[PDB]
Design a binder for this molecule. Structure first.
Ligand SMILES: Cc1cc2nc3c(=O)[nH]c(=O)nc-3n(C[C@H](O)[C@H](O)[C@H](O)COP(=O)(O)OP(=O)(O)OC[C@H]3O[C@@H](n4c[nH+]c5c(N)ncnc54)[C@H](O)[C@@H]3O)c2cc1C
Length: 503
């Protein structure tokens, strides 16, 4: 089936959060399920004996089909020195470039869980109720958020260790600076094992977070989905995963199942085979970008002609803005910074000035006095994915001026911190032009197939039976916090209902 093309009861496209939840519960329900993942299974030791490259030694494993490595955003001034030309390869992190927006996504078994910062945050209930008023919030907070927390292996940093360790001085500095302006911080739960991280600092186990690894994968410590949901899904005996298989087209068969055209490639991107795979139940977990692209293509090329006009709409970058402050000489942030953030500034009150900002580490490995922040804001602007039949790609029509409300919210917060401390921004971290706020990237794409718009309230695609969307494309552009816990919890809610009523 996977091998030659054929029929499987359920197919799940992708292996990120929505996909992984869906496949686990399908398998536990006894439904034979095939997951199709375009990237690799990341389990083979590489030229350095490690699965993943670090941020100070990027190689082809860092990048999805690019010809040169790139510095982590914010660190070009210190990390461009380590960039090198590379072979285009099926690496783990893909910078997807649209007209006026670059979106970072993971590529591999586990999706973005391979490359993300592990920050596992529940949204504020009042904001959840605002953005998804058709969803029963009691079920979410009483049942599905706790379920997600537990399954994901969320854990909490030890406060005494945090207070003491050199590896979190950067966080304590921003906490103090924040405190001088009346802004409070919060600890951020994580899927990286904080007990492991303590042992890293003590020299007891191989370092990962404490060896400048995160955005190209963690060789140790991080409980990505391959270790949690996907391991459990495989354990059911009802789930298999085929890698380097990219779904290209979706059609409805004449008897109401689904048929897929699927390209199999090698890690150099050479096409090996094109296969037809069919199923009764089809679940899309290809992400905000990937799920939406499949559906706008299907609509506009006539293979799923009854998809509605909301497919493609309602995209936002979770209000993502990156900025940085220059510390006083007397406030060094340290040469040793854990690559996993632990603290944020919660200035989120659901108003338009809301900001939830994580205090981000920097990987340079020498003192720079820079404090870096990733701000999550409340900006009502949305973009639309539009199918381009000429190139066969979904184009995102978002313009940089659409991020002006996000910039304004972030700037008002950090202006308060600067005023209280007599500090200034950095203006040189994102390029040659004076620019203190990076306003054209996204790590947390949300929307394109919005819950209740393009789908019913459980992700059933409008116009079709047994066709489901499971992932960040469901969320209406913003959740006010790092999104994977919400994606996971919503997917738990959705698949349980779908299995009960439809399967
Ligand atoms: C650098 C970075 C830092 C981040 N930090 C955080 C964090 O700390 N906490 C947080 O909450 N979020 C974080 N995020 C966002 C988070 O990783 C993201 O919201 C979720 O991974 C999205 O989950 P999905 O299931 O929507 O989707 P995702 O995890 O992107 O998975 C989609 C999967 O589908 C695969 N795929 C796509 N198209 C196809 C196709 N046509 N055929 C086959 N396979 C396909 C794809 O390769 C991938 O493995 C971060 C993301 C990045 C890039």
């Amino acid at each position: 089936s996977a091998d030659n093309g054929g029929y499987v009861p359920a197919v799940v496209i992708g292996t990120g959060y929505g996909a992984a939840v869906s496949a686990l519960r399908l398998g536990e329900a006894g439904v034979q399920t095939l997951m199709l993942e375009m990237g690799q299974l990341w389990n083979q030791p590489g030229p350095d004996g490690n699965i993943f490259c670090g941020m100070l030694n990027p190689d082809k494993r860092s990048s999805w089909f690019k010809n040169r490595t790139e510095a982590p955003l914010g660190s070009f001034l210190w990390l461009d020195v380590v960039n090198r030309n590379i072979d285009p390869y099926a690496g783990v992190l893909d910078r997807v470039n649209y007209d006026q927006m670059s979106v970072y996504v993971g590529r591999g078994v586990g999706g973005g869980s391979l490359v993300n910062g592990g920050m596992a945050v529940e949204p504020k209930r009042s904001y959840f109720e605002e953005i998804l008023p058709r969803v029963d919030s009691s079920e979410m907070y009483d049942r599905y958020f706790p379920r997600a927390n537990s399954m994901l292996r969320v854990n909490h940093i030890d406060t005494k260790w945090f207070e003491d360790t050199e590896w979190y001085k950067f966080a304590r500095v921003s906490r103090e600076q924040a405190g001088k302006a009346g802004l409070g911080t919060v600890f951020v739960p994580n899927v990286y094992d904080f007990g492991y991280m303590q042992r890293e600092a003590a020299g007891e186990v191989p370092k990962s977070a404490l060896a400048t690894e995160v955005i190209y994968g963690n060789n140790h410590g991080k409980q990505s989905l391959d270790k949690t949901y996907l391991a459990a899904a495989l354990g059911t005996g009802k789930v298999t995963i085929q890698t380097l298989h990219q779904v290209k087209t979706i059609r409805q068969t004449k008897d109401g199942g689904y048929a897929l055209t699927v390209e199999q490639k090698d890690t150099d991107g050479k096409l090996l085979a094109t296969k037809e795979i069919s199923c009764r139940y089809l679940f899309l977990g290809a992400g905000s970008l990937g799920s939406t692209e499949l559906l706008v293509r299907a609509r506009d090329t006539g293979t799923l002609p009854n998809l509605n006009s909301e497919v493609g709409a309602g995209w936002g970058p979770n209000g993502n803005i990156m900025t940085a402050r220059a510390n006083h000489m007397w406030n060094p942030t340290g040469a040793h910074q854990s690559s996993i953030p632990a603290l944020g500034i919660d200035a989120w009150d659901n108003s338009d000035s809301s900001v939830f900002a994580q205090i981000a580490p920097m990987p340079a490995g020498l003192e720079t006095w820079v404090s870096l922040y990733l701000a999550i804001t409340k900006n009502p602007q949305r973009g639309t994915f539009v199918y381009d039949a000429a190139t066969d790609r979904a184009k995102l029509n978002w313009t940089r001026d659409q991020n002006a409300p996000a910039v304004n919210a972030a700037k008002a917060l950090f202006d308060r911190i600067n005023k209280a401390n007599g500090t200034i921004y950095r203006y040189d971290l994102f390029g040659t032009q004076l620019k203190a706020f990076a306003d054209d990237f996204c790590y947390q794409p949300l929307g394109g197939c919005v819950l209740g718009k393009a789908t019913d309230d459980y992700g059933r695609v409008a116009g079709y039976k047994n066709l489901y969307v499971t992932d960040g494309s469901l969320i209406p552009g913003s959740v006010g916090v790092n999104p994977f816990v919400t994606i996971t919890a919503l997917a738990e809610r959705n698949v349980e209902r779908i299995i009960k009523q439809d399967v």
